[PDB]
Amino acid sequence: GMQDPQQQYHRCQRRCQIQEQSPERQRQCQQRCERQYKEQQGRE
Protein backbone atom coordinates (compact mmCIF):
# COMPACT_ATOMS: atom_id res chain seq x y z
CA GLY A 1 0.00 0.00 0.00
CA MET A 2 2.51 2.59 1.24
CA GLN A 3 5.23 1.17 -1.08
CA ASP A 4 8.96 1.57 -0.43
CA PRO A 5 10.82 5.01 -0.92
CA GLN A 6 13.21 3.69 -3.60
CA GLN A 7 10.14 2.97 -5.72
CA GLN A 8 9.04 6.61 -5.29
CA TYR A 9 12.44 7.97 -6.43
CA HIS A 10 12.31 5.92 -9.63
CA ARG A 11 8.75 7.17 -10.26
CA CYS A 12 9.76 10.88 -10.35
CA GLN A 13 12.76 10.10 -12.60
CA ARG A 14 10.83 7.70 -14.84
CA ARG A 15 8.42 10.41 -15.83
CA CYS A 16 11.38 12.80 -16.02
CA GLN A 17 13.40 10.65 -18.48
CA ILE A 18 10.43 9.63 -20.64
CA GLN A 19 9.33 13.28 -21.07
CA GLU A 20 12.96 14.62 -21.02
CA GLN A 21 12.52 15.15 -24.80
CA SER A 22 10.92 18.56 -24.14
CA PRO A 23 12.92 21.21 -22.01
CA GLU A 24 9.75 22.29 -20.18
CA ARG A 25 8.98 18.70 -19.18
CA GLN A 26 12.43 18.48 -17.63
CA ARG A 27 11.56 21.44 -15.41
CA GLN A 28 8.21 19.93 -14.38
CA CYS A 29 9.72 16.49 -13.61
CA GLN A 30 12.69 17.98 -11.81
CA GLN A 31 10.27 20.11 -9.76
CA ARG A 32 7.97 17.12 -9.16
CA CYS A 33 10.91 14.95 -8.06
CA GLU A 34 12.44 17.77 -6.04
CA ARG A 35 9.26 18.25 -3.96
CA GLN A 36 8.26 14.59 -4.07
CA TYR A 37 11.76 13.47 -3.09
CA LYS A 38 11.68 15.67 0.05
CA GLU A 39 8.24 14.23 0.93
CA GLN A 40 9.69 10.73 0.47
CA GLN A 41 12.50 11.58 2.89
CA GLY A 42 13.17 15.12 4.13
CA ARG A 43 16.40 13.92 5.76
CA GLU A 44 19.32 13.99 3.29
Side-chain angles (χ1 to χ4, degrees):
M2 188 177 180
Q3 289 171 330
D4 61 57
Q6 65 266 32
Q7 188 176 321
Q8 290 294 317
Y9 181 62
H10 284 79
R11 185 72 175 276
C12 77
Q13 187 172 321
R14 189 180 182 181
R15 288 181 175 184
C16 197
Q17 60 183 288
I18 294 298
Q19 293 172 331
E20 193 178 321
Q21 188 178 324
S22 299
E24 290 79 16
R25 292 287 184 83
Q26 188 183 322
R27 291 180 181 277
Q28 286 92 52
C29 64
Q30 288 292 315
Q31 288 294 116
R32 287 172 180 273
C33 192
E34 182 64 21
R35 292 177 65 257
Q36 187 177 344
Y37 181 79
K38 291 289 184 180
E39 190 279 330
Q40 184 185 315
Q41 190 177 323
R43 189 184 69 189
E44 271 286 271

